[PDB]
Amino acid sequence: TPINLVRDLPQGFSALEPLVDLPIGINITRFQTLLALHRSS
Amino acid sequence: VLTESNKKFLPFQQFGRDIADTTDAVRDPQTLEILDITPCSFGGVSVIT
Numbered sequence: 001t002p003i004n005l006v007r008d009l010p011q012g013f014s015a016l017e018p019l020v021d022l023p024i025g026i027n028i029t030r031f032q033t034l035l036a037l038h039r040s041s
Numbered sequence: 042v043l044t045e046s047n048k049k050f051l052p053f054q055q056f057g058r059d060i061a062d063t064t065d066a067v068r069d070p071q072t073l074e075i076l077d078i079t080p081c082s083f084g085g086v087s088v089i090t
């Protein structure tokens with residue numbers, strides 16, 4: 001969705017359409033986001 | 042009856058169900074044509090004598 005705000009998640013409604021079912025059969029109990037860095041310790 | 046559907050099925054959607062979970066619209070597996078389904082015409086028969 002188009003957003004012109006950088007914080008304080010805007011109110012209103014917006015549905016999340018399914019994008020992939022991923023027929024996987026693993027167990028997941030620990031999650032960790034993978035974030036890029038602006039490397040330019 | 043397989044009339045041409047006016048429903049705007051989203052790309053991920055396949056079917057459309059009635060309040061009683063009876064399918065009232067279907068997605069053709071071979072093509073993205075949306076077909077709405079109406080029950081075969083029926084009704085009572087009364088004899089006037």
Ligand SMILES: *[C@@H]1O[C@H](CO)[C@@H](O)[C@H](O)[C@H]1NC(C)=O
Binds near residue numbers: 027
């Ligand atoms: C969670 O996944 C692990 C795999 O490391 C497995 O040993 C464990 O039995 C799983 N637990 C459940 C509740 O499925």
